[PDB]
Ligand binder design. Structure first.
Ligand SMILES: [Cl-]
Length: 171
């Protein structure tokens, strides 16, 4: 079972209570996203849906950054080992898609070594999965409101443009 080891954290109210290393290795306090609507997603470079996901995320960011949309991308190698490269290589991969949103260092999203933000997101009322809460594949997406609460989860079968219709409610 996936366990928080600071059991307090089952009572965390917001993504803004968490921190993560950016793709350059620097700690980022996620409270910087207060007042912004965020899409948080796990990414891979060698996935079957890598091209559509990066392309559409870059498009949403281009079209809605000025409305308050931010995107946090977390590389993860847990799905067919489809993100095997170094953070430096992943950074250059994203640059080829002209990514202007925020890239993070590679993490686990499932299991005992999952980043705490990911452990927390999947037990939120609106972050729950269909059969259990595990992240099922690359490019699961969580929509986070301006107060840092999880408001919707989109599975790997949902391309990022599907999210577009839901954004105006949270801006
Ligand atoms: Cl994929």
């Amino acid at each position: 079972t996936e366990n928080l080891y600071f059991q307090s954290m089952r009572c965390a109210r917001s993504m803004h209570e968490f921190s993560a290393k950016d793709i350059d290795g620097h700690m980022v306090n996620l409270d910087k996203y207060r007042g912004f609507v965020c899409i948080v997603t796990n990414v891979a470079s060698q996935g079957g849906k890598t091209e559509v996901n990066y392309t559409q995320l870059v498009d949403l960011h281009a079209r809605y950054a000025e409305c308050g949309l931010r995107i946090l991308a977390f590389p993860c190698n847990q799905f067919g080992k489809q993100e095997p490269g170094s953070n430096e290589e992943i950074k250059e991969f994203a640059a080829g898609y002209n990514v202007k949103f925020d890239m993070f260092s590679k993490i686990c999203v499932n299991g005992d070594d999952a980043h705490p933000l990911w452990k927390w997101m999947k037990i939120q009322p609106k972050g729950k999965g269909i059969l259990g809460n595990a992240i099922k594949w690359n490019f699961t997406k969580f929509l986070i409101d301006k107060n840092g609460c999880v408001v919707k989860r989109y599975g790997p079968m949902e391309e990022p443009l599907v999210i577009e219709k839901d954004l105006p409610h949270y801006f």
